[PDB]
């Protein structure tokens, strides 16, 4: 009476509160794993986006090394830099 | 025999976890390496291209610069390229210890 | 791009020096930004394992 009355059912109750919490927690984990991964994405995809400018800049610099302040390259390079930048502001 | 199931769960869990960390570690280091390269490999092409162009017929004035330039950009990538490799090589070496613990 | 539509002989030497500084500068600044970011990415790695 007492066993099959309150005891066993009580146990079956915690087994559920546990299995219940086990689940919510497992999902609380899946979330973090998704959140972390999303951050890591944003980061590298930014890294590389900054990369785009870097290279352009780095190039333009070398062009300045020709001395011809009038060289089409250095002039164009300088114009591109202003575009590459502008596009960086819109998407990102 | 519950302990059995337990103790090993413990071990494998923590190891398998470290392995992931290690894997993830590599990935980032790969990205860096490659990206670093893609950056230089990119300015470089523009400069080599320019050199090939500006010196169809010898350009006596820009000659000294072109030379200095060719050197810097080459010298530079050469270094950058090297470090990329070492970075990668080291990442490869990382898994070794874990790989043993696994076995 | 403006001051040298037609070559400006006087400002020529400055313009060059300037082009260098500003470019050189951003080049460095830009680089460090990347490393900073890359390091941030690396940060989650340990935790990501502990999670699993
Ligand atoms: C802040 C305009 Hg590229
Ligand atoms: C311009 C050779 Hg990666």
The CA dihedral of A38, C44, C31, C33, to the nearest 10 degrees, is 70
**Which sign does the torsion angle of CA A19, A24, A28, A31 carry?**
positive
Dist. CA C48–CA A79, nearest whole Å: 43
| Pair of tokens at residue C28 | 């460095």
Nearest to B29 by CA among B101, B85, B97: B85
| Separation of alpha carbons B28 and C44, rounded Å | 11
CA separation for the pair B39, B43 (Å, rounded): 7
Instruction: Give the method used.
Output: X-ray
Resolution (A): 3.3
B103 to A66, B16, B48, B94: CA distances (angstroms): 59, 12, 50, 16
B44 Cβ closer than 6 Å to some ligand 2 atom: yes
Spell out a b/e string for B48-57, using b for 16 or more CB atoms within 10 Å of the CB, else e.
eebbeebeee
Contacts of A88 (CB under 8 A, 6+ apart): A49, A52, A53
CA distance C21 to A56: 16
**Helix residue ranges per DSSP H, chain A:** 2, 8-64, 72-91
Q: Residue C43: how many CA atoms within 13 Å on its side-chain side? A: 13
Place of tokens 């490393």: C35
User: Which chain C residues touch A60 with a CB distance below 8 Å?
Assistant: 19, 23
What is the Å distance from ligand 2's center to C35 Cα? 23
Q: Report the distance separating Cα A73 and Cα B75, nearest Å.
A: 22
Minimum distance, in Å, between the CA of residue B103 and any CA atom of chain A: 27
Helical segments of B1-103, H only: 2-54, 63-102
Verify whether the Cβ–Cβ distance A66 to B69 is below 8 Å.
yes
Q: How far apart are CA C27 and CA B83, in angstroms?
A: 19
Q: Residues C20, A64: contact at Cβ < 8 Å?
A: yes
* Backbone angles phi and psi of C6, in degrees to 5: -105, 135
């Amino acid at each position: 009476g007492v066993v099959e009355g309150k005891l066993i059912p009580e146990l079956k109750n915690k087994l559920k509160s546990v299995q219940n919490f086990f689940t919510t927690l497992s999902n609380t984990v899946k979330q973090a794993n998704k959140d972390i991964d999303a951050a890591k994405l944003k980061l590298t995809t930014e890294i590389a986006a900054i990369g785009e400018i870097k290279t352009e800049t780095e190039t333009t610099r070398f062009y300045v090394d020709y001395d011809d302040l009038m060289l089409s390259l250095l002039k164009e390079a300088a114009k591109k830099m202003i575009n590459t930048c502008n596009e960086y502001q819109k998407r990102h | 025999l519950s302990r059995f199931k337990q103790e090993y769960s413990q071990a494998a869990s923590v190891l398998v976890g470290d392995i992931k960390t290690l894997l993830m570690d590599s990935q980032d280091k790969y990205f860096e390496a490659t990206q670093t390269v893609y950056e230089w490999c990119g300015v470089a092409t523009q400069l080599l291209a320019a050199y090939i162009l500006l010196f169809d017929e010898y350009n006596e004035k820009k000659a000294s610069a072109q030379k200095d330039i060719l050197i810097k950009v080459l010298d530079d990538g050469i270094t950058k390229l090297n470090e990329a490799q070492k970075s990668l090589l080291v990442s490869s070496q990382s898994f070794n210890n874990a790989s043993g613990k696994l076995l």
